[PDB]
Amino acid sequence: TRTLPPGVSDERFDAALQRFRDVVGDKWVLSTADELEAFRDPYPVGAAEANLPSAVVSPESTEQVQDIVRIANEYGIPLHPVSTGKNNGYGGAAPRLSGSVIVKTGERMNRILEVNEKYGYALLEPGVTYFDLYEYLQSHDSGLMLDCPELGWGSVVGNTLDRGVGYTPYGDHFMWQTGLEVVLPQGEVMRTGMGALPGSDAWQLFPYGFGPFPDGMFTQSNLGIVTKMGIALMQRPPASQSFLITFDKEEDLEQIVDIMLPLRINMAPLQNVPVLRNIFMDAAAVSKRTEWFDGDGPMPAEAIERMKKDLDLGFWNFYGTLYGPPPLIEMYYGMIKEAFGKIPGARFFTHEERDDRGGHVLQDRHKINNGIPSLDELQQLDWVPNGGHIGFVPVSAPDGREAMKQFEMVRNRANEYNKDYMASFVIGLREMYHVCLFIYDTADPEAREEILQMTKVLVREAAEAGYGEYRTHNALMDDVMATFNWGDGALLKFHEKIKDALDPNGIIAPGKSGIWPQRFRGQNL
Amino acid sequence: TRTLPPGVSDERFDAALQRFRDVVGDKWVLSTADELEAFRDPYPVGAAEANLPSAVVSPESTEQVQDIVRIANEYGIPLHPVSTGKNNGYGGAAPRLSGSVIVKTGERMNRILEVNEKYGYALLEPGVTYFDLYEYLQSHDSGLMLDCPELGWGSVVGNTLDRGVGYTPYGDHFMWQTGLEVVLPQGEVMRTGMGALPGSDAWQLFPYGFGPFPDGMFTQSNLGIVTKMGIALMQRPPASQSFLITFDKEEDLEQIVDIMLPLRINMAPLQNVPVLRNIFMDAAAVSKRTEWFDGDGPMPAEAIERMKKDLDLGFWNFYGTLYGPPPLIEMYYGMIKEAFGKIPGARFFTHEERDDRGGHVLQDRHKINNGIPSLDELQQLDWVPNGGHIGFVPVSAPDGREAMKQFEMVRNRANEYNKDYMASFVIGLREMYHVCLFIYDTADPEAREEILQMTKVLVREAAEAGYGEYRTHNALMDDVMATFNWGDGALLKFHEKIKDALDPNGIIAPGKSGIWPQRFRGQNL
Ligand SMILES: Cc1cc2nc3c(=O)[nH]c(=O)nc-3n(C[C@H](O)[C@H](O)[C@H](O)COP(=O)(O)OP(=O)(O)OC[C@H]3O[C@@H](n4cnc5c(N)ncnc54)[C@H](O)[C@@H]3O)c2cc1C
Ligand SMILES: Cc1cc2nc3c(=O)[nH]c(=O)nc-3n(C[C@H](O)[C@H](O)[C@H](O)COP(=O)(O)OP(=O)(O)OC[C@H]3O[C@@H](n4cnc5c(N)ncnc54)[C@H](O)[C@@H]3O)c2cc1C
Ligand SMILES: COc1cc(CCCO)cc(OC)c1O
Ligand SMILES: COc1cc(CCCO)cc(OC)c1O
After folding, report:
1. Does the distance separating the beta carbons of B261 and A490 come in below 8 Å?
2. CATH number of B240-473, picked from 3.40.462.10, 3.90.550.10, 2.170.150.70, 3.90.700.10
3. Looking at the domain covering B10-104, what would its CATH class be?
4. How far is A352 from chain B (nearest CA, A)?
5. Of the candidates A40, A47, A55, A119, which has an alpha carbon nearest to the alpha carbon of residue A87?
6. Rounded CA gap, A343 and A167, in Å?
7. What is the CATH number of domain A479-520?
8. CB-based contacts of A519: which residues, under 8 Å, 6+ apart?
């Protein structure tokens, strides 16, 4: 059957598709099953079909976005705006609401509008990937560096708009986002901050402007379609050194985190975003599961010791990067060695001390942590046939016992559902993103359903323990927002009220972050 | 005559006042003219009466705030929430809309709810002043320090809610704000961030929570009455050093700013928030105008030279503070001396090198920049009889030509309207707050009217040159929001839609930031 927007007939949708073609050109509207396969979730969750797009519209300009939104309002067509649509682990480009039209802004709105060397910023359209911006900075001999997530094929804008993160001192992308332009849900266009002052040169200099500060309301949001976004860019330091600390025992996690916090909270000596990855995460980056265990069910401890011995890695592997003059780097590395060396069996390696396969992750972090984008971690998806992943990322206090509690709770459910537990604590100043990647055979419908049921269990169990997730997959958005229900669901009620005011026809990404416009509430999707 | 809410009769207002007394206690409702005199703007702007409160209500609890908001909805009573109501320069405690009832949350909601040494944060009620928090930290021998504005008698919460700023590395108060509790305009209570997840310990560790990020919409805002707010607290460094650089000429401003930017953008060597204050600003802190000049009109060049000579200060005076191990401080100070020394006439002083009257401001900055609150700057108001100030604060790029353009533009109008121009550039990473404090005799109605007309001209003239203000006085809020009118007033229309959705009866601080609810729009008050 043809995927159609809810309540929209074949005739009405054909008519809307043609109005879209009038705006963007016939080449830039996709609506056949073969064309749309590329836009389904690449890592499907659940046995049954879900998150089916009805079309893809690729606008060239803000003016075209406004016209697309107005047409969607006339026809009642839901729109899922994306930048590059590489939100893999959280749905890809696929809409939360099946039948929605994807607005792929980044296909043609892909210009670097400004890179300012003096004030250190960029003004970007959504199609600028991290690779694109890196190539620009390299080609202009820029003194600036970008901040990228693990995979460079995503969007500087799009990643920020889901509050994604990277690993340099500028790792909080939303923090350094400065100014945006957005098409509101009925087609009006708005600039935030100093961009609201005509002729201001400070759109990318001063984020707040005047009055209530709105930009965060357009992140993890369905309140508009972003068409331009500014971001601050850090100056590249004169030198850097990355390092790996291997820790032998599962149980070391508690002491690692507790030693880490005093070294991190003042952004020195731990200047970048430390990451603490387990052996499964690192092994998946350089090898397939069957090299260590080709049997049924969870991997046995003998197979784990082999992974560690052969890759020369610990169960927990701490990656960091230091920046600045060589003397500062040496002083900070000495402090780090002296602190973590109090853990029995810890071993230290700089990026120049490992040329072996187990050191491939360290080399990859040394790129990433220096704003050099990479795709090396895509090899994690070769762990099993037809590999995909889902991201389960609860927030943790930077406390070793809390980390251990979360590790044990996730590992337990992981084992129960026969999914390997790849873990990476991504460490901020006062919080940790406990990244749980579950890699699975996306062609196997029982594996897909196990992933869905396992993660719904984990969302509930984590919440009963006081833990919430910072970001989540289409399939989990209602469940995750349901956990943030202090005061009889006060937060969601507030969001719904704003959603219905700005989007009275219920057009933009219905269900994003569990926020449904009035016409869709009380339904089973 | 008695001050009444718009459209509310004496009999209705009396009934509402008694309902307020039911909630908070009859002792905690003020409504006579003598009682309300203290809640008038202490630095009145304009000759005519403006911004008159009809009553003051002091709630003891969030539950009482909810009840007050419910009563106000029933009766159509506008409410102006304040914490400590010390917003001097911007209206004091006085409401934008005359006839509003001030809700002074800080009078009785004044508890430090938590200070966490390990993770470095505080959870505060609105009545905690900077002095209160400092005394707590001292009393408990805390390793943490606060970040305060120039005057310590304001509210850690209230200052943040107007996006006020201080001068340590944590000087962006809203940035370090983490979690809040707010009573929405119809009386519902909501927690943001991880506080929306019942049982989370991360309310003050991770600001975003899940879904659209709303906390900024409650700053410079009329979308609620905030009852609790968290804020991160920096660890106190092992050592510090403050310094003053004096520069001889008005025209040095261009070179000072251009030398400063490379030293600031990486947060080192200029680690704190530098301030660049002109001789009028520093002279007012230690002396009266008639010490230097008792004639008519703007101060002549020779009197300006006498201020410089006796106080041993420049026309421009640069104040900074360095932090960290003693060798790091000495290396950074050497970098700062080498850079700024290229300006002919520059002279350098650390806080150890001046014990004269001219050095009083340096010693005060050494307290403020180390989280030690002060009221010394209140002496600026003794510059002339019955002294008050208004804050005209355009944002400037950190560019010397732009700073000079703004200086010359403001000086030109200050001279025209016979107001001394006290200037302080408060310097962020990529932007400066160009603080123009105009000090005037508040008893002189012509001076008050000159201040109003001069600043209205400056708002328009600055906007014509592409500059907007970050914060403003009641009397200028409509004019300032009117300058942020890109896209035919798109930003204000967006704020108005949200305002009417959350506040359908138009109760909370109508006209704050130029944002009026439907029932008042177009009424010219
Ligand atoms: C192995 C692996 C490792 C990963 N590591 C990381 C990591 O380190 N850090 C990280 O952050 N992520 C990580 N991810 C997740 C994902 O790869 C990235 O976050 C990716 O950059 C997001 O996709 P994107 O940039 O194309 O954004 P998009 O998919 O274009 O956008 C993401 C979402 O933002 C919203 N949005 C986007 N554009 C607009 C717009 N114009 N208007 C309105 N709303 C919009 C929509 O809700 C959209 O679904 C990882 C994934 C995998 C599989
Ligand atoms: C000489 C001088 C120097 C100054 N220097 C500085 C400086 O360095 N930095 C600086 O930031 N300011 C400065 N100011 C301005 C002012 O002194 C401070 O900002 C002061 O801290 C603000 O008053 P307050 O803290 O009592 O906040 P309040 O007056 O309580 O609140 C300010 C506003 O925030 C909102 N608000 C407050 N509480 C609530 C609540 N509970 N719910 C909802 N909304 C609320 C209201 O709009 C209120 O009007 C200066 C003023 C002068 C005269
Ligand atoms: C920090 O946020 C994320 C980190 C990773 C991988 C971290 C590997 O060390 C994946 C994500 O989504 C799939 C995230 O959101
Ligand atoms: C940085 O923000 C402000 C600074 C000052 C005075 C700075 C003196 O050096 C006053 C203000 O309001 C009256 C401000 O908002």
Report:
1. no
2. 3.40.462.10
3. alpha beta
4. 27
5. A40
6. 25
7. 1.10.45.10
8. A505, A506
